[PDB]
From Swiss-Prot, chains A, F, G:
Annotated S-S bridges: none
Protein name stated in the entry: Sliding clamp
InterPro entries per record: DNA_clamp_sf (IPR046938), DNA_pol_proc_fac (IPR004190), Sliding_clamp_C (IPR015200), Sliding_clamp_T4 (IPR046389)
Keyword ATP-binding: no
Reported function: Sliding clamp that encircles the genomic DNA and links the DNA polymerase to the template to control the processivity of DNA synthesis. Responsible for tethering the catalytic subunit of DNA polymerase to DNA during high-speed replication. Interaction with the sliding-clamp-loader opens the sliding clamp so that it can be loaded around the DNA template. During transcription, encircles the DNA and tethers host RNA polymerase (RNAP) to it.
Pfam families in the cross-refs: DNA_PPF, gp45-slide_C
GO BP field: bidirectional double-stranded viral DNA replication; DNA replication; viral DNA genome replication; viral transcription
Swiss-Prot record, chain B:
Location of the region described as Interaction with host RNAP in the Swiss-Prot/TrEMBL record: 31-61
Family: Belongs to the Tevenvirinae late transcription coactivator family.
Single Gene Ontology BP annotation: late viral transcription
Name of the protein described by the UniProt record: Late transcription coactivator
Gene transcribed to yield this protein: 33
UniProt GO molecular function: transcription regulator activator activity
Organism of provenance: Enterobacteria phage T4
Domain notes for this protein: The C-terminus is involved in transcriptional enhancement.
Assembly with partners or alone: Interacts with the beta subunit of host RNAP RpoB (via flap domain). Part of the transcription activation complex containing host RNAP, the viral RNA polymerase sigma-like factor, the coactivator gp33, and the sliding clamp.
Taxonomy, superkingdom: Viruses
Purpose of the protein: Activates transcription at late promoters when the sliding clamp is present. Binds to both the host RNA polymerase (RNAP) and the upstream dsDNA.
Length: 228, 71, 48, 86, 100, 228, 228
C-alpha cells in the first residue's frame, strides 16, 4: 500500500506531534500529544489497510524517502513491515501499539463558542516572529471587538499584560468576553489558513485549528478565561 | 601560548615515540599530562590521525576482550 | 641489598648496565626507629 | 656525611615545632570512598598526598602545578613519600 | 557490581584463552604449568584506580571499554602437572551451566 | 523608515562590529568596535526617522525579515520601536543610549599614505584562507615593489615570518615602506570592493576600507611601523 | 603540478579511508586504511612531480579549492608544498611520510571466485539505508542462484538472523554459494556503477568493486562462508 507524497507531508506533520503512531486501517491517520492535550487528525488520500504500530515514524518516513515511491508496502510474514521494489526488499520492524500511544479516536470536537480563521501568512507570521521576540504563549481574546492573537512572553510575563506581538485576524462582534491562553507549544500546526474554533465551557475549552490537511484540536490551558 | 593546531601536534607527537620509543599510547598520554590535558576535551588538541593508530595498536595489544574484537 | 631504596635502585641499574659500584646511602628502617623514638618526647637529633 | 648522634628532651614547644598540624577527629575512613577523614588520624590535611602530586581537588597534574597547596583539599601538592615521615 | 566466570578477559594473549572452554574452565587432561590461567573471573573497575594510560582509551572507545578487569585463577608459580577433576559450585535456583 | 533587504543586510554586517548601535538621524549608520579598534559607517537610502540605541541588532533584523513588507517601523509610545504591518504588531524595547558604545561622530579618515585596492574574490579568498591555515594577522608591506598582504599566525609565527601565502594588494612604486598590521579579529568587511587607505605616524596607525557601500576603519597593530 | 577536479575528487574520497596520503612522482595514487581491510586506488590523468606525504588531505584540498585550478603544485623552498596560485603562492607543510602508513605496492587482486555487479542507485541506496537502519553488517549471499545482499545490524543480531535489507544484485550462474560478510564502515566509495569480483578461499577473501575511475579492495569479514 503506497504512501503518497501528500501522504508523506501529512505523516511529517503528524510525526511532529509524536515520533510514532499505531497506523489504523482507513483513509485517515491521527495521533495525540504524549499528554493528549493537542491532537492531530487527517482524512488522507491513502487508505490504510493493515494496522501496524511504528515507533520512529519520523525515521520511518526517512526510510520511505530512502526508497522509491511505488515500492509495495505490506506487513511482512513475521508481522514486520515490507518495502518492496523491483529489487529492494526491506523489513522495517513493526512496533508494539503500547510502546507508542495512539489517540482514543478522532476528537469529536464540540461546537465552537467563537469562530475566526487565521491566514497562511498570519500563522506563518505569528509563529515565526515569535523567535525574534521570544514569544512562549498566545492570548486569543476579545479586543476592540476583534479576535486578537496576542503573542505573550509567559516566561517574562505570566500575567500576559506585556504585549510584544499581537495578531488581529478580524473583529468579533461580542459582549461575552474572554482571554483564551494557549501554549505557543500547542501550535503543532503547519503554516496556512487555519479556521480557529474557540469552544469555551466552564474551564474546559479548546481551539480547533482546521487547516488544509489536518484538524488539530488543542485543549485550552487552565489560564484561558472565558465569560458568556 | 595557544597550541590549537592538531596536525602540528601530530608532528610533535610522533616526535614522542620516534624519539623516545615506548608506544604511541604512553607517548601521547605523557603529552596529555605534560601539558595537562583531560580526555574529553582532546579533539581540539590531538590530530585526527594518531587516534587511529592508537585504536590499532590497542586492539592488537588486546587491551580489551574478544567482545571488542569482532567489532 | 636490603633497604637503601634509592641505593638499591641505583645498584640494580648499574649492574644491569655493566658497572659494579656502590652508593652507600643510609638505612631506612633506622629512620623508622628514629621517628619511633621521636614519638615519645625523647628528642633525638643527629649533630652536624 | 654526618658526625655524632645526640639525645635530649623536648619542650612541648619543640613538639609543636615538629608537627605539620594537629589532629582532633578520632576517626579515619569514609568506608565508602575509603578515603581519609577531614581532620582525622590519617587525614591528608596534615600528613599529605595519598597519591603523588595530586589530591581530591584533581587540580594539579604536572610539575607546573606541583607544590602549591590546594584550597579544596587544602593539602600541599607533592609525592606521597613525605607522608611516610611527617 | 558482581563478578563473572566468563572466558572473557582483557589484555591477555588469546593463545592462552584458547586453552579454556566456552564457560572458562580448562579441560580435563590439559598439562599445565605456572604463570597460566585456569579460570576467568572478572570484576567491575572502580574509580580511584584509573590511570591516565587507560583514560586515553576509555575516552576514545567510549566508556564501554574499561569497565572490567581480570582476577583469573592462575597456576601458582613453581608448580606444574595435570588436571584431574574440576568441581563447580553454584547457588541453586541460579542458572546452572554446561559443566554443572 | 522601512529598511530594505540591502539596508538590513548592511545592518547585519555592521553587527559584526557591534551588537550595540546608535542608529541616528538621517540615512547614515555609524558604529565602532567595542575595543575601539574597528569603525564602521555607511550611508543608507532610507531615513532613520527616530534616534535609537539597540543592543541586539541582528534580532531586530529578523523581526524585520518575517513580517509583511507593509510593516510600519516607527517610534512606539514608550520611547521605543514599533514594527507593525497591516494586521499585526511587534514591540521592540529600545536599549538605552547611555548603555551603547559607539563613535561620537563619523570617522572620515582625512589622510592616507599608502593607497591600494582589494576586490571581491581576493576578499573572500583571504577571509577563507586565514580561516584555513589559522592565519591570525595580515601585514601590508612592499616586497619586490608590490603592496602585498602577507598572512601569518602569531602564536607560532611570532615575528610573522612564515609566508605560507602571499596575496598582492597591488603594485607599489614608492619609497615609503611600512608594516601596516591588522589582526584578523578586526576583519569584518563584507562582500564588496574596498579601497584600502593606509595612514600611520609614529606608532599610531589606521587602515580604512572604503567599499561599494561603507567605510571600515582599523587601528593598525602596535608593532605597525612606517619609514617615510 | 595541477590536479583536475576529478583528481582532487579522487583525493577527496581518498581522505575518507585515511586522512592524508603518501604521493610519489607519477600518475597513480593508492590508499589503505591502517587496518589493512580497505584499499582504494586510482590512476590520475594528472601527473605528480615529486615525492611527498600530506598529513591533512582535507585542509589541503580545501585551500586548493579556493585557487583557480592553474595553480602549480611544486615543492616549496622550505621543504613543504608550494602551490603557486595564479595570483598567490601558498605554502602548506609537507608531511614526513613515515608518519602516514604508505603502502609499498599497489594491491593485486588474484583470481576471484564469484562475479556480479553493483550500480550507482543500488550502492548509494544501500549507503543511505545503512544509516536509517544503522546497519553495520552486509551479508552477500546466493538465493535461488541469485547473488544478492542481506542487511543486518550485527549488534542486535549476533549470527545475523534479522535481514534488515535485501536487494537483487545480479545472477550467479552456479550453485557454489557463500555469505561474504562486510562491515558498512568500509563502503566508502563514491556512488556509481561497479563491477564486483570476489576472491574467496578457505578463510580469506577479497571484495573487488571496480569503478568508472578506480578500484576498491576490501577485506571480507572472517565470519563469511563460501564454497566453490
Ligand atoms: Zn581539592
Amino acid at each position: 500500500m503506497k504512501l503518497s507524497k501528500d501522504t508523506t507531508a501529512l505523516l511529517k506533520n503528524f510525526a511532529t506531534i509524536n515520533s510514532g503512531i499505531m497506523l489504523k486501517s482507513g483513509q485517515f491517520i491521527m495521533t495525540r500529544a504524549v499528554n493528549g492535550t493537542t491532537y492531530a487528525e487527517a482524512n488522507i488520500s491513502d487508505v490504510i489497510d493493515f494496522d501496524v504500530a511504528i515507533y520512529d515514524l519520523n525515521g520511518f518516513l526517512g526510510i520511505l524517502s530512502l526508497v522509491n515511491d511505488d515500492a509495495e508496502i505490506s506487513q511482512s510474514e513475521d508481522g514486520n513491515i515490507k518495502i518492496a521494489d523491483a529489487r529492494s526488499t526491506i523489513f522495517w520492524p513493526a512496533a508494539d501499539p503500547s510502546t507508542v500511544v495512539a489517540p482514543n479516536k478522532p476528537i469529536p470536537f464540540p461546537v465552537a463558542s467563537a469562530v475566526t480563521e487565521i491566514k497562511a501568512e498570519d500563522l506563518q507570521q505569528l509563529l515565526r516572529v515569535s523567535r525574534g521576540l521570544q514569544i512562549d504563549t498566545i492570548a486569543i481574546t476579545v479586543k476592540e471587538g476583534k479576535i486578537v492573537i496576542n503573542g505573550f512572553n509567559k516566561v517574562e510575563d505570566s500575567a500576559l499584560t506585556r504585549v510584544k506581538y499581537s495578531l488581529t485576524l478580524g473583529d468579533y462582534d461580542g459582549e461575552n468576553t474572554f482571554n483564551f491562553i494557549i501554549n505557543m507549544a500547542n501550535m503543532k500546526m503547519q503554516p496556512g489558513n487555519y479556521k480557529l474554533l474557540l469552544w469555551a465551557k466552564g474551564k474546559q475549552g479548546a481551539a480547533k485549528f482546521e487547516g488544509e490537511h489536518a484538524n488539530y484540536v488543542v485543549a485550552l490551558e487552565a489560564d484561558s478565561t472565558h465569560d458568556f | 601560548a595557544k597550541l590549537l593546531d592538531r596536525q602540528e601536534n601530530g608532528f610533535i607527537i610522533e616526535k614522542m615515540v620516534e624519539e623516545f620509543g615506548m608506544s604511541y599510547l604512553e607517548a601521547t598520554t605523557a603529552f596529555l599530562e605534560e601539558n595537562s590535558i583531560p580526555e574529553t576535551q582532546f579533539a581540539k588538541f590531538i590530530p585526527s590521525g594518531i587516534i587511529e593508530k592508537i585504536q590499532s595498536e590497542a586492539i592488537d595489544e588486546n587491551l580489551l576482550r574478544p567482545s571488542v574484537v569482532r567489532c | 641489598k636490603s633497604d637503601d631504596v634509592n641505593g638499591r635502585t641505583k645498584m640494580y641499574k648499574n649492574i644491569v648496565d655493566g658497572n659494579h659500584q656502590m652508593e652507600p646511602g643510609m638505612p631506612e628502617s633506622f629512620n623508622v626507629l628514629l621517628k619511633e623514638i621521636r614519638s615519645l618526647g625523647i628528642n633525638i637529633e643527629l649533630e652536624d | 656525611e654526618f658526625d655524632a648522634i645526640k639525645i635530649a628532651l623536648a619542650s612541648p614547644d619543640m613538639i609543636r615545632s615538629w608537627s605539620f598540624g594537629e589532629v582532633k577527629k578520632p576517626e579515619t575512613i569514609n568506608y565508602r570512598t575509603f578515603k581519609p577523614e577531614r581532620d582525622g588520624l590519617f587525614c591528608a590535611r596534615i600528613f599529605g598526598p595519598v597519591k603523588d602530586y595530586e589530591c581530591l581537588c584533581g587540580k594539579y597534574k604536572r610539575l607546573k602545578h606541583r607544590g602549591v597547596i590546594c584550597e579544596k583539599c587544602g593539602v600541599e601538592v607533592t609525592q606521597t613519600k613525605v607522608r611516610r615521615e611527617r | 557490581g558482581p563478578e563473572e566466570i566468563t572466558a572473557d578477559i582483557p589484555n591477555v594473549g588469546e593463545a592462552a584463552l584458547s586453552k579454556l572452554d566456552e564457560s572458562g574452565i580448562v579441560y580435563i587432561g590439559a598439562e599445565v604449568t605456572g604463570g597460566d590461567i585456569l579460570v576467568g573471573k572478572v570484576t567491575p573497575k572502580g574509580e580511584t584506580q584509573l590511570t591516565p594510560e587507560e583514560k586515553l582509551l576509555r575516552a576514545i572507545f567510549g566508556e564501554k571499554a574499561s569497565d572490567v578487569k581480570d582476577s583469573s585463577l592462575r597456576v601458582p608459580n613453581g608448580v606444574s602437572g595435570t588436571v584431574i577433576d574440576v568441581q563447580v559450585f553454584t547457588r541453586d535456583g541460579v542458572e546452572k551451566d554446561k559443566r554443572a
